[PDB]
């Protein structure tokens, strides 16, 4: 029993020690001890309602693609343009998939054909308001929220003057699409990285537009197609007599 | 607090609070959010503050940390900063209470007798507190730094 009592720290509460005539050893480190707020990297992304998944990593047609890589690109383009919504195999644009299989079109032109398809018009254009349509087209094609209330007015005015197909082409022929997706990269979510020439409020707006990996820009939610970024909050960042 | 002090004087004279006493409760409570912010900032930087106080102290008195010094050695120095952490805590309490009642019962009444027993040099504890004032005060706006400073100078005063 001496050893048990003595020779052993034992259980009091917890904890011990460091005191008179004194002390104990397990070493130490000055910039070793972890600061209390305390934790992680990736808690940050994952904390919210994780958007663990977007930091991104684009997929593409690395010249000399396999049929398995091509099918992964096709599945990624449908998941990006239509969200997590189920698409029946009969509803797929088999002509555009055949053109991409033949290498006769690039991933940009395949995205153009999918965004001009009547299926995209039925789901997003006919079921939502023109302002909510523009928010979703920025989400699907550019991977971001809109920067200012001027972008909305320019896109609304172009849509009124030149119709639906010219409005879709305006996103895809943009120097922003070309600079950051090029010809062979599938569209992907970007609003979680500070990007050059951004507006800090784009992060918060892209979070509001990204309800997570189980959300549906699905056009059925009883109310149906609404809006999600506020006009008052949209106006902070700019407001001009464009 | 300001409340406790006002009331105790009221009850001891068998009376309701004065217009004056009522006024100070009102001015005090209006400064509530500000006082809470002053305590938060200082709570948030506590580890930095004691340290910089501790460096300022050992330059000014390298002897305390010398052969015949009360704080000589690694664990006689560890306890010394812990005491500096104690007093910063009490200073945050005082600021949110708007007087010293709490600061006083917890860490000045009896402090002469405690430290005399331990043979701790009291006036160099007062210096450690001035050192904390200097650090803490550099993390606060002019107006909040003064409001905080009164409570630091009180402790410095009571160790005297």
């Amino acid at each position: 029993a001496r050893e048990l009592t003595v020779t052993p720290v034992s259980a009091r509460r917890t904890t011990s020690p460091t005191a008179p005539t004194a002390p104990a050893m397990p070493l130490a480190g000055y910039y070793s001890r972890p600061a209390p707020r305390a934790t992680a990297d990736g808690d940050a992304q994952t904390k919210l309602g994780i958007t663990a998944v977007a930091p991104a990593q684009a997929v593409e047609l690395r010249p000399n693609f396999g049929e398995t890589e091509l099918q992964a690109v096709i599945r990624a383009t449908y998941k990006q343009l239509f969200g997590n919504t189920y698409i029946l195999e009969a509803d797929r644009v088999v002509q555009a998939e055949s053109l991409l299989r033949n290498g006769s079109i690039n991933v940009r032109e395949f995205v153009r054909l999918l965004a001009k398809s009547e299926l995209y018009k039925e789901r997003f254009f006919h079921c939502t308001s023109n302002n909510r349509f523009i928010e979703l087209t920025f989400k699907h094609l550019l991977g971001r929220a809109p920067y200012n209330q001027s972008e909305f007015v320019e896109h609304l005015d172009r849509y009124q003057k030149s119709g639906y197909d010219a409005e879709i082409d305006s996103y895809i022929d943009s120097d922003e699409y070309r600079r950051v997706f090029g010809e062979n990269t599938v569209p992907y979510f970007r609003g979680f990285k500070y990007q050059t020439g951004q507006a800090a409020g784009v992060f918060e707006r892209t979070l509001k537009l990204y309800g997570g990996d189980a959300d549906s820009d699905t056009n059925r939610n009883r109310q149906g197609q609404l809006r999600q970024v506020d006009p008052q909050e949209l106006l902070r960042s700019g407001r001009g007599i464009v | 607090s300001v409340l406790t002090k006002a009331i105790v004087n009221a009850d001891a004279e068998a009376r309701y609070l004065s217009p004056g006493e009522l006024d100070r409760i009102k001015s005090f409570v209006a400064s509530g959010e500000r006082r809470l912010r002053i305590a938060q900032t200082l709570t948030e930087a506590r580890e930095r503050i004691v340290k910089q106080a501790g460096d300022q102290l050992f330059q000014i008195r390298p002897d305390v940390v010398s052969p015949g010094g009360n704080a000589y050695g690694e664990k006689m120095t560890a306890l010394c900063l812990r005491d500096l952490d104690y007093y910063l805590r009490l200073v945050t309490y005082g600021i949110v209470a708007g007087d010293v009642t709490p600061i006083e019962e917890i860490g000045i009444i009896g402090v002469k007798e405690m430290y005399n027993s331990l043979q701790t040099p009291i006036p160099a504890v007062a210096e450690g507190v001035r050192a904390m004032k200097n650090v803490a005060t550099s993390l606060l706006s002019g107006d909040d730094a003064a409001e905080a400073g009164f409570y630091f100078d009180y402790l410095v005063g009571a160790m005297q």
């Binding site: 904890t15 | 560890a78 812990r82 952490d85």
Partner: peptide
């Protein structure tokens, strides 16, 4: 029920039955 007995969490002028829950223990850090 035990509601009458419940406000006995106030204890006395200053009497709390033992150990004040979690208590910070800064000595390691110092």
């Amino acid at each position: 029920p035990t509601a009458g007995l419940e406000p006995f969490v106030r204890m006395s002028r200053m009497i709390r039955s033992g150990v004040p829950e979690d208590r910070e223990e800064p000595d390691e850090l110092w």
